[PDB]
Amino acid sequence: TEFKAGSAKKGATLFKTRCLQCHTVEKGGPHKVGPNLHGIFGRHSGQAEGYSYTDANIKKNVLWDENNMSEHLTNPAKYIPGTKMAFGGLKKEKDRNDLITYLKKATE
Numbered sequence: 001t002e003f004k005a006g007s008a009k010k011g012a013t014l015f016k017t018r019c020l021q022c023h024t025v026e027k028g029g030p031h032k033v034g035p036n037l038h039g040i041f042g043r044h045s046g047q048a049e050g051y052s053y054t055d056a057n058i059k060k061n062v063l064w065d066e067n068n069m070s071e072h073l074t075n076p077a078k079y080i081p082g083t084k085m086a087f088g089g090l091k092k093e094k095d096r097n098d099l100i101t102y103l104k105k106a107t108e
C-alpha cells in the first residue's frame with residue numbers, strides 16, 4: 001500500500017520539465033545524456049549494459065522499485081552522489097508519486 005492512487009498526468013509534465021530532456025525512456029530508443037529507463041522497476045541499475053554509469057551508481061548500485069524510486073527523488077544527492085545527474089528533491093510527496101506513475105506506465 002506504499003503507493004497511493006496518484007495521477008501520472010501531473011507527474012507527466014514534471015518529467016517533461018526536468019527529465020524527458022535527459023531521459024528518453026523511448027523503447028529500443030537510443031541513449032541521450034542519461035541512460036534510457038525501461039522496466040528498471042524491480043531491477044538493479046546497469047541493465048542498459050550499453051550506457052556507462054557514474055562510479056557512484058556502479059559502486060553503490062541501488063535496487064530500483066516504486067519504493068526505492070520515491071527515495072531517489074526525495075534526496076537524489078546523498079542517494080547517488082558523484083553522478084552528472086542533479087535533480088532537486090520535491091518537498092511535496094504527492095507530486096513525487098505522480099512522477100513515479102508516469103514512468104511506471106511506460107513499464108506496462
Ligand code: HEC
Nearest residue numbers: 015018019022033034035045046053054057083084085086
Ligand atoms: C540530465 C541532466 C538528467 C536529468 C535531468 C535526469 N537524469 Fe537521471 N540520470 C542522468 C545521468 C547522468 C545518469 C547516468 C549516471 C547514473 O548512474 O546516474 C542518470 C541515471 C539515472 C538513474 C539511475 C541509472 C540506472 O539505475 O540505470 C535513474 C533511475 C534516473 N537517472 C532517474 C531520473 C529521474 C527520476 C529523472 C526525472 C524524473 C532524471 N533521472 C532526470 C542524468 C539525468
